[model samples]
Target: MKETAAAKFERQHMDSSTSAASSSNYCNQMMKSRNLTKDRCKPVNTFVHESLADVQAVCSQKNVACKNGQTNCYQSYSTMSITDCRETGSSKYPNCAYKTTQANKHIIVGCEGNPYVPVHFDASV
Candidate 1:
């Protein structure tokens, strides 16, 4: 079978240590051209919810254990609403929900009980 372009290029260019170094250099240059960096760290924001009510309600609804699976320590009622929300914590990316920089700007309201008047609000990072 005829060698494909990729296979021929790989065979010709990726065999020696010098070639590997050149490849790395080429990659670095390409990344620089695209404003990307191998070692650069991007600025990250922290996200915190306004109240624990929504989280607590979800946990309760799912019958999932609270922090540390501590049954006795978990309160029956919801906790206080957070004054501000940010995007800077350990649970930053996946769990924290802040889409912008503004504080408490994104409110997620939910209702509970019959004639449920929105009872809980959650803010994300």
Candidate 2:
């Protein structure tokens, strides 16, 4: 089966789980379950706690510039809950560890596909 970038992005970033004791545990589990720490530890990653529709709606909200010189970025109109996960300095592959941080920000993403959904997570500001 083939997966589109939008689908891949969803797998990597979207999370609506409400019950969580520790953010660090969440990151450690999610990053691995999402296959980001397979070949090498992913230095950083983020998870959005909003519904898929809310995130997809960002594509039609505010136009923004992408860091890669691409013109397909958009910013959310409202701030959304998010968690950023960064690998610890001593983290190793197959045993990756991360520090998690909670935040609320307007997300920036790059959209693609016929329906124009977010495929790249650009930033949160």
Candidate 3:
């Protein structure tokens, strides 16, 4: 419920004023902000910087095989701003070594509702 706000905040923001939008240290810094570096360095995750309405619309835009191997998935018609967070196997737990990258891609998402909205971020293609 309230978790998405924090998850979305991890990759989509740097500072309140977005002072670190393109910082090369984004993943390390961003994950730190999300408190993912406390004990367990989380694994691969992604975020798409698009409006909720637009993300929700993907359900009707295109259909695809979900990476999850079951259920329906939707992909964006075009590329959109996104962030990639990857674990690089750091020696320590709190120091989540990561590959922080940004890009634009047609991403896959899962949704289900009368007016569908993204419920899961599958991947970026």
Candidate 3 RMSD computed on C-alpha atoms after optimal superposition onto the true structure: 4.1
Q: Encode model 2's per-residue lDDT on 46-102: one tens digit a residue.
A: 899988899999999999899888889999999899989999888988899988888
In the predicted model 2, the residue pairs found to clash are none
Model 3 worst lDDT window (10 residues): 11-20
Root-mean-square deviation of each candidate, in angstroms?
A: 21.1, 1.6, 4.1
TM-score of each: 0.18, 0.93, 0.72
Give me the runs in candidate 3 sitting further than 4 Å from their true place.
1-21, 35-39, 89-91
Across residues 39-105, which tens digit of lDDT does each residue of candidate 1 receive?
4422332222333334334323322233444332222233322222223344232233212322323
Q: Is 1 or 2 the stronger prediction by lDDT? A: 2
- The model with the greatest TM-score is 2
Candidate 3, residues 38-96, lDDT tens digits: the string is: 77777876656666566667888888889868668888897777778788866357557
Candidate 2 lDDT score relative to the true structure: 0.87
Clashes of each: 13, 0, 0
Q: Which parts of model 1 are misplaced by more than 4 Å?
A: 1-82, 85-104
